[PDB]
Structure 1
């Protein structure tokens, strides 16, 4: 798995791979590692797939109940903390979770919280989680700027997943892109890594090591 999310001028980019493996066996190439918690909040799926799926759609239910009671959009801080407090109750039981809770509100602006099954809750600008996280971090760190355009930020997230997909054996399949704005997230398509790799190799002149 490779999942990333980073804050920038235009909001948040969320990018993930699509591969699921059981040992060396590739179980699926069409997995959704971005949970659509609600139209404004996104969560990434790493570690236990069920644990992420189950508890983040549950989180969506809690967020819905909040805004029904309080007549106001839940903050990313509050939404993330509901999840982190929950998993912290289960600490020791064997939940496996590494997720970025991503959202864009009035009071906070674009906000990303890394939430962990050990109970860790970190606010940050750039997060990268999974077996291919180190590969994606490299591309991110060397190319990231706050004043990235929405177009360039989307490409950076896509390219960083590709970097991981290539090297990390347990990452690949396809790239899912999301752009999170204040008015909600916008889906930016599924991109097959096989086709994307050759396309990027040619247009970018990268991956000279690989014969195409």
Structure 2
């Protein structure tokens, strides 16, 4: 459930894992936790997979209707408000969705955090999931504005790696996308964390890594 997204000079970086658990058992190791809501807006998944997916796609449909109607791209703030209102309509019903809506609109680059309890917040650095705390700790420690794209992707990959390292519910593959003015690009579609660990912490394959 580890999600990650931060804003820097050349746009926004979004990162996710690929694990899915039915308790103590992992149902699937490869899932897509990033959805192309619009040509310039992405949204991560945290918590209830089905609720998040269905409501993200419903929001995409609503955005399509509005954009086709008024003939102008919607803003990230408007999408966040719509999603928050719809989720709040189902308060006290069991939804456990946590979303990070990130995109570029006519105002610039924007990021928002939304929760099943209608918790709309605006910021430049967010992370939700079981491993969110570790990602936050490794971001704040080394995060900095105005760093090149390569450094941004490396930092995101390292944060996701460490989050998966100390989280049973986080793992699988790390997907890292980059959002810029004209749409987005998939820097890393999927990377097995196996070689990632054996390259970051235990470069020498001798003896167990004791922590």
Smaller-chain TM-score bracket: over 0.9
What is aligned with 1:195? 195
Give the Å deviation of 1:77. Answer: 0.3
Deviates further, 184-193 or 112-121: 184-193
Structure 1 equivalent of residue 156 of structure 2: 157
> Runs of 5+ in structure 1 lacking a partner?
none
- Structure 1 position 38 matched with structure 2 position 2: no
**Paired position in structure 1 for 2:5:** 5
Task: Measure the CA separation in 1 of the matches of 2:111 and 2:140.
Answer: 17
Q: In the TM superposition, what are the counterparts of 1:131-146 in structure 2 within 5 Å?
A: 131-146=130-145
Alpha-carbon distance change, 209 to 10 in structure 1, aligned in 2, over 3 angstroms: farther
Does the CA-based 8 Å contact 1:106-1:182 persist in structure 2? no
* Count of aligned pairs between the two proteins: 207
Map of 2:78 onto structure 1: 78
Q: In structure 2, what is the Cα distance between the partners aligned to 1:10 and 1:136?
A: 21
Q: CA deviation at 1:38?
A: 2.1
2:169 and 2:74 map into 1 onto residues whose CA distance is 35
1:83-142: per-residue Cα shift (whole Å, max 9, x none)? Answer: 1110011111111111100101232x1111000001100000110100011111111001
Correspondence 1:183 to 2:186? no
Q: How far, CA to CA, are the matches of 2:100 and 2:186 in structure 1?
A: 17
Tell me how far apart the structure 2 counterparts of residues 151 and 89 of structure 1 sit (CA, whole Å). Answer: 41
Q: Structure 1 length as normaliser, TM-score?
A: 0.93
1:58-69 counterparts in 2 under 5 A? Answer: 58-69=58-69
State the Cα distance separating 1:63 from its structure 2 match.
1.0
Farther-moved stretch of structure 1 (32-41 vs 2-11) = 32-41
Residue 49 of structure 1: how far off its partner (Å): 0.2
1:12–1:179 Cα contact (<8 Å) kept: yes
Query: Which runs of 5 or more structure 2 residues have no equivalent in the other structure?
Result: none
Q: Tell whether 2:52 aligns with 1:52.
A: yes
Secondary structure of 1:42's partner? strand
How big is the shift at 1:145?
Answer: 0.8
- Helix, strand or coil for the counterpart of 2:127? strand
